[PDB]
C-alpha cells in the first residue's frame, strides 16, 4: 500500500543494555516463586530476562522513541494479558504511519 | 493430587507400600527418606475438564485500551466503570459468558442468569 | 548523615597483591543453608580434577589409607581462528572445581556462567571497618553431587529401554539391598574399616 | 520522473522482487493429524546472518491422543528423538522440582504436572549431568579418543549448534534451560487446549526479503568460495613465489 | 612447598555486592585507579532502606554525583567469596591429574545486594541517556667400509651427506661390493 | 517530538484506531468507544498504486477492480519523457 | 479488524455491509467485500485445472 | 535496502571472515627447528568507487 514501509534492522545491544539498565532481572538469579507474576522480556525472540514494573518500562520506551532516541522501525507489544514483552529489530518488517 | 517432592532432594516422593502395616508410604526414589501420605486417593484422571474460563486475571487489565467499557456496577463497590470480555477458555463448546471487572474495587463478577 | 554507620569509604585494594591473585565467586543449589567450615570433614582440598566416572574416584582417607597400607605429516594444515582470550577459557574450564571434605562424605562440582560477573564488584567491611574494592572476575555455581549413590550407564540403558511396560518401581532400593554401586562416604567408610 | 531503484545488466532496467518467508527465530505450534502418532508439535527457525545458511531447525514432538503421553525433542545432530529430561539433566539441572519451574510457572495449577509425570517417571533412569550427556546421537563424523561418546563432543554440541540464537560462547546454559522450558510450557498449553493454535497467515509472523539481504546472500557465498580459493594456491606455492 | 589446604579464618566476614551501571565500572576497574582513595560518601538511613551515593567531585562532572543505591537484596544466604593466588614454590587412584590448587582462601559472605543508579535530577543523568542513544675410488671404498660399519642400514641419503661427490661415481663404487 | 508513529504489523493486537478524526472524537446520504490512541491518516491510503486510480472505487464490485487492476498496466500512454 | 474494541458480534463488526452500492461502502465494509470476492477468484482459479483435467 | 547495504553489512561482512594464516613453525620436526614463518593474510577496510 502507499504508505507502506520496510524495516532495515538495528542493532539490538543498545536497548538490551538500557533495558537492564532501567530494571530487569537477568535470567541466571531469576526464580518462580519470588516472582510470580513478573514479565518475560523478549527481542527479537531471545529471553532477556524477566521485570517486575511493566508499565513504567513501556510507557518509557513509549517516550524514548517518540523523542527519537530509538529509530522508529523498532516496535515494543505489551502483552497484558500473557505478561509479554516484546522488542523486534529485525529488518524485513512492514509499517505504516499513523 | 499434587505432587509432594521430597524436602532433602528435591524429587517427589513416589508411592509406596507398608507391607505389614499398610500405610501409604511416600518414599523419596532418590535418597532414602520416607514420608506418609494423608488419604488413600493417589492417581486422578478428571476425563471431563470445564474450567479455565475466568483465566488471566492480571492486576491490571485496565490498562489495556482495546477492551470495551460498560455501565454495571460491582456488587462491592457500585462503581459504574466496569470492563468485561469474553471467557477465556477456548472451545468449540464455551458459552458467551460476559465477565465483569470493575477498576474501582478489583473485583470480578459474572452475570449468568440461571 | 550522622556517624550512625560505619562511613569507612573504599580503601582499594593493594596493587602488588593484585597481580598473580583471581578471586572468583562461589554459589551453592540447595534450599538449606550450608557453612562447609563448620559441616565439612576438614582438610578441604579444592582441586581442578577432571569428572570421568567420580563414583569410582579417590576418597582422600582412602588414599591416605591406602599410602600408608603400601609404605606421516601432511605438511599442510589451516587453523580456524578463534579468540585467544575465548580459547584459553575453554581451556581452563576443560576441568571444573572440585570440592571435598576428607572423608569424601559430601562432595560439591562447580561450573562457570557467564551471565554478569564483569559487572559485579565487591566490597568488604574488614576488622578495622576498611571497605576492601574488588572488582570480581568470574562466578561459579557448585551443585552437591552423588549424595545418593547414582546408579550408572550401562544398567541404566536395560532399564530405559522398552522392555519392561515400566521400570520397578524401588528398582534403586532393591540394588542398594543387593549391594552393587554404593556411596562414595559407603565407599570410604568400608575402607576405613578394613 | 524516472523515479527508479533498479540494475541496468546489459543495457536492460532489471529490477528485484521482494520475497517473503515466514519470521524467524519465533515460536510456533501446530496440531497434526490424527493418524499420525504425533499430535502437536512446536518449531523454531533460527539464524545468525549467514554464515552456512544457519537453518538449525528444532522441533519438540507429542506422542498419543493415556499411555503413550511422551515428550520427545529432536535435535541435531542427535539421530534419535530425546526425553527432554535427558535434555535438562544435559544443560545441568538435577533436581526435578527444579525442572518443574523451570517448566510450569504457577505451582498452584497441576494439570500441567500430572500432564508432565510420565516424562519426569522416564527421567527416572539418569541422575547426573554427563551420565545424560552421554548419550548416543552418532551421525558422524569418526570418533577420536572416546569410550562411547565424548562428553566434550556432546557438550560442544549443545554450545555451538544448539538453539544458535540467544548465545554461542561457552556458558548459558540456564538461559538455554529457561528458553527449552518456556518452549514446551507454549506446547503444552496449546495441547491443554487452554491456548489456541497458531496461525501461519498471520502478516506479522512474515518478513519481506529485499535488495539488500538478496545481495548479502549472494556476497557472502561468493565470498567464502573466494576464501576457499584464496586458500588454494597459498599452501600449494610451496614453490616460489608468494605471488 | 606450601600446605594445600585452603583458608578459613575470614568466612565470618561481610561482604557486599554491587551491580554497577557500565560507565561507572569502566571507571572503578582501572589499574591507574584502585589506590586506596575515597572517591565518594555512602549514606543509610537509620531505619535503612534508602541509600544515596554521595560522589565527590572527583569525577570532574561529565557523571553525576547523586546515585540512588537500591539494596536489590536485603537478605542474601549460601554466598561465599573466595580468593585464588598462586603459590609459593578399584583402588587405582590416579595420582596426578595436573590439578594445581593454588593458595584459595575464603574473605567473606555476602548479606546484601545493591544496584547504583543515579538520581535523574542530576544534569549529567539522563544526558548518558542521549549518549547511549549517540553510541679417489680407493679413499672412498675404505672410508665406505668404516661407514656401514657404523652402521648396516647406511641409506643412499646418508651415503650421499657423508661424501659431497660425483653421484654417479658414487653409485658404481657402493653396489661394486655391497648395498 | 511525536506526533506520528511507525506501526508494524502486530502492535495492531495492542491498539486501537479511528477512521475519521472526528468520528468519535467529540463526545439521506450515507450511513456510517472512547479509548482511542491512534487515528489513521486517511482511509484511502489502504489502496495501491494501480487501485487508487479507479474512481469512485467504495462504488462498485471487489472483483471488477481486481480486473481494472489488471488491465491498466496493458494501457498506453507515455512512459518517459528521454 | 483492528478499528473495534475486543469482543464484538454487532454485524457491522462481523461484516454486514449494510450499505448499498448508490451510497458506496465504509472502509471496514469495503474490505470484507474484497475478501469475498477475492475468495471467488481463487476457487475459480483452481477449479478451472482440477476440471480440465478430470474432462481430460 | 541498497543503501543499508552499501553503507554496512559489507564492511561487516568482510569483517567478519578476514583472517587467513598459515604460520609455519616446521608442521614437523626438523628442519633444525625451524621458526614460526607466520605466512598471514587479512583484510582491512574496504573501498567503493
Ligand atoms: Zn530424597
Ligand atoms: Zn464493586
Given at each position: 500500500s502507499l504508505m507502506s514501509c520496510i524495516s532495515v534492522g538495528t542493532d539490538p545491544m543498545p536497548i538490551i543494555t538500557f533495558l537492564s539498565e532501567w530494571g530487569m532481572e537477568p535470567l541466571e538469579d531469576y526464580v518462580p516463586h519470588q516472582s510470580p507474576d513478573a514479565t518475560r522480556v523478549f527481542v527479537n525472540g531471545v529471553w532477556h530476562g524477566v521485570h517486575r514494573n511493566p508499565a513504567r518500562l513501556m510507557e518509557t520506551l513509549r517516550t524514548l522513541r517518540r523523542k527519537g532516541d530509538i529509530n522508529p522501525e523498532v516496535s515494543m507489544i505489551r502483552d497484558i494479558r500473557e505478561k509479554e514483552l516484546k522488542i523486534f529489530t529485525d529488518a524485513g518488517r512492514v509499517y505504516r504511519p499513523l | 493430587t499434587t505432587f509432594r517432592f521430597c524436602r532433602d532432594c528435591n524429587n517427589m516422593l513416589y508411592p509406596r507400600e507398608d507391607k505389614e502395616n499398610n500405610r501409604l508410604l511416600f518414599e523419596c526414589r532418590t535418597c532414602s527418606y520416607v514420608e506418609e501420605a494423608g488419604s488413600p486417593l493417589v492417581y486422578r484422571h478428571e476425563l471431563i475438564t470445564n474450567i479455565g474460563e475466568t483465566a488471566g486475571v492480571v492486576q491490571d487489565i485496565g490498562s489495556d485500551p482495546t477492551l470495551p467499557r460498560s455501565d454495571?456496577?460491582?456488587?462491592?463497590?457500585?462503581?459504574?466503570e466496569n470492563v468485561f470480555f469474553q471467557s477465556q477458555q477456548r472451545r468449540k463448546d464455551t458459552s458467551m459468558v460476559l465477565f465483569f471487572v470493575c477498576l474501582s474495587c478489583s473485583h470480578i463478577f459474572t452475570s449468568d442468569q440461571k | 548523615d550522622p556517624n550512625e554507620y560505619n562511613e569507612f569509604p573504599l580503601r582499594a585494594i593493594p596493587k602488588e597483591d593484585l597481580e598473580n591473585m583471581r578471586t572468583h565467586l562461589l554459589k551453592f543449589q540447595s534450599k538449606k543453608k550450608i557453612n562447609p567450615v563448620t559441616d565439612?570433614?576438614?582438610?578441604?582440598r579444592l582441586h581442578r580434577k577432571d569428572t570421568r566416572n567420580l563414583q569410582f574416584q579417590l576418597t582422600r582417607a582412602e588414599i591416605v589409607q591406602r599410602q600408608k597400607e603400601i609404605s606421516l605429516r601432511r605438511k599442510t594444515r589451516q587453523l580456524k581462528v578463534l579468540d585467544e582470550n575465548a580459547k584459553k577459557l575453554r581451556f581452563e574450564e576443560f576441568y571444573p572445581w572440585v570440592m571435598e571434605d576428607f572423608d569424601g562424605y559430601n562432595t560439591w562440582v562447580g561450573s562457570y556462567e557467564a551471565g554478569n560477573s564483569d559487572s559485579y564488584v565487591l566490597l568488604s567491611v574488614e576488622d578495622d571497618g576498611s571497605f576492601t574494592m574488588i572488582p570480581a572476575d568470574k562466578v561459579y555455581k557448585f551443585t552437591a553431587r552423588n549424595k545418593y549413590a547414582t546408579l550408572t550407564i550401562d544398567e541404566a540403558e536395560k532399564r530405559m529401554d522398552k522392555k519392561s511396560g515400566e521400570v520397578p518401581r524401588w528398582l534403586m532400593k532393591h540394588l542398594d539391598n543387593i549391594g552393587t554401586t554404593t556411596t562414595r562416604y559407603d565407599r570410604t567408610r568400608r575402607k576405613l574399616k578394613a | 520522473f524516472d523515479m527508479g531503484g533498479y540494475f541496468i545488466i546489459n543495457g536492460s532496467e532489471k529490477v528485484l522482487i521482494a520475497q517473503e518467508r515466514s519470521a524467524g527465530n519465533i515460536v510456533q505450534v501446530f496440531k497434526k493429524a490424527a493418524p499420525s502418532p504425533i499430535s502437536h508439535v512446536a518449531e523454531i527457525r533460527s539464524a545468525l546472518e549467514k554464515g552456512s545458511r544457519f537453518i538449525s531447525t528444532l522441533q519438540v514432538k507429542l506422542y498419543g491422543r493415556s499411555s503413550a503421553r511422551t515428550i520427545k525433542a529432536t535435535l541435531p545432530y542427535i539421530k534419535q528423538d530425546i526425553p527432554i529430561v535427558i535434555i535438562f539433566r544435559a544443560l545441568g539441572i538435577i533436581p526435578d522440582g527444579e525442572i518443574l519451574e523451570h517448566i510450569c510457572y504457577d505451582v498452584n495449577d497441576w494439570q500441567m504436572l500430572e500432564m508432565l509425570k510420565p516424562c519426569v517417571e522416564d527421567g527416572f533412569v539418569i541422575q547426573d549431568r554427563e551420565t545424560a550427556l552421554d548419550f548416543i546421537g552418532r551421525r558422524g563424523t569418526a570418533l577420536g579418543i572416546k569410550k562411547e561418546k565424548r562428553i566434550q563432543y556432546a557438550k560442544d554440541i549443545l554450545q555451538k549448534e544448539?538453539?544458535?540464537?540467544?548465545?554461542?560462547?561457552?556458558?548459558?546454559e540456564s538461559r538455554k534451560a529457561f528458553f527449552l522450558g518456556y518452549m514446551i510450557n507454549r506446547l503444552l498449553l496449546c495441547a491443554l487446549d487452554r491456548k489456541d493454535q497458531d496461525d501461519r497467515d498471520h502478516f506479522g509472523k512474515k518478513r519481506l526479503d529485499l535488495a539488500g539481504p538478496l545481495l548479502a546472500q549472494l556476497f557472502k557465498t561468493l565470498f567464502k568460495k573466494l576464501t576457499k580459493d584464496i586458500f588454494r594456491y597459498m599452501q600449494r606455492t610451496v614453490e616460489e613465489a608468494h605471488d | 612447598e606450601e600446605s594445600l589446604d585452603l583458608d578459613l579464618e575470614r568466612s565470618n566476614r561481610q561482604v557486599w555486592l554491587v551491580r554497577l551501571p557500565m560507565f561507572l565500572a569502566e571507571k572503578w576497574r582501572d589499574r591507574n585507579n584502585l589506590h586506596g582513595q575515597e572517591l565518594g560518601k555512602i549514606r543509610i538511613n537509620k531505619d535503612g532502606s534508602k541509600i544515596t551515593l554521595l560522589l565527590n567531585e572527583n569525577d570532574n562532572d561529565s557523571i553525576p554525583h547523586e546515585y540512588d543505591l537500591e539494596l536489590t537484596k536485603k537478605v542474601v544466604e549460601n554466598e561465599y567469596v573466595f580468593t585464588e593466588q598462586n603459590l609459593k614454590k578399584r583402588?587405582?587412584?590416579?595420582?596426578?591429574?595436573?590439578?594445581?590448587?593454588?593458595?584459595t582462601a575464603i574473605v567473606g559472605t555476602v548479606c546484601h545486594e545493591c544496584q547504583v543508579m543515579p538520581s535523574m535530577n542530576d544534569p549529567n543523568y539522563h544526558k548518558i541517556v542521549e549518549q547511549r542513544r549517540n553510541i679417489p675410488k680407493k679413499e672412498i671404498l675404505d672410508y665406505l667400509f668404516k661407514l656401514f660399519d657404523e652402521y648396516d642400514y647406511w641409506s643412499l641419503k646418508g651415503l650421499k651427506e657423508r661424501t659431497r661427490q660425483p653421484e654417479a661415481h658414487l653409485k658404481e663404487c657402493l653396489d661394486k661390493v655391497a648395498t | 517530538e511525536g506526533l506520528v508513529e511507525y506501526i508494524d504489523a502486530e502492535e495492531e493486537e495492542s491498539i486501537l484506531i479511528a477512521m475519521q478524526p472526528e468520528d468519535l472524537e467529540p463526545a439521506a446520504k450515507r450511513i456510517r468507544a472512547t479509548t482511542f490512541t491512534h487515528c489513521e491518516?486517511?482511509?484511502?491510503?489502504?489502496?495501491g498504486v494501480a487501485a487508487?486510480?479507479?474512481?469512485?472505487?467504495?462504488?462498485?464490485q471487489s472483483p471488477r477492480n481486481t480486473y481494472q487492476s489488471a488491465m491498466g498496466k496493458q494501457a498506453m500512454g507515455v512512459f518517459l519523457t528521454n | 479488524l483492528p478499528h473495534f474494541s475486543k469482543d464484538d458480534y454487532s454485524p457491522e463488526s462481523k461484516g454486514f455491509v449494510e450499505n448499498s452500492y448508490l451510497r458506496g461502502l465504509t472502509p471496514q465494509e469495503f474490505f470484507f467485500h474484497a475478501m469475498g470476492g477475492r475468495e471467488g477468484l481463487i476457487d475459480t482459479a483452481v477449479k478451472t485445472a482440477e476440471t480440465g483435467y478430470i474432462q481430460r | 535496502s541498497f543503501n543499508q547495504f552499501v553503507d554496512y553489512t559489507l564492511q561487516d561482512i568482510i569483517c567478519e571472515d578476514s583472517t587467513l594464516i598459515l604460520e609455519q613453525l616446521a608442521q614437523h620436526t626438523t628442519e633444525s627447528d625451524n621458526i614460526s614463518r607466520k605466512y598471514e593474510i587479512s583484510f582491512g577496510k574496504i573501498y567503493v568507487t
Open positions: - | 454495571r456496577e460491582c456488587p462491592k463497590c457500585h462503581s459504574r | 565439612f570433614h576438614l582438610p578441604v | 544448539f538453539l544458535p540464537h540467544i548465545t554461542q560462547l561457552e556458558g548459558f | 583402588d587405582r587412584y590416579i595420582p596426578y591429574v595436573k590439578t594445581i590448587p593454588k593458595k | 491518516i486517511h482511509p484511502s491510503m489502504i489502496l487508487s486510480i479507479i474512481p469512485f472505487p467504495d462504488h462498485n | - | -
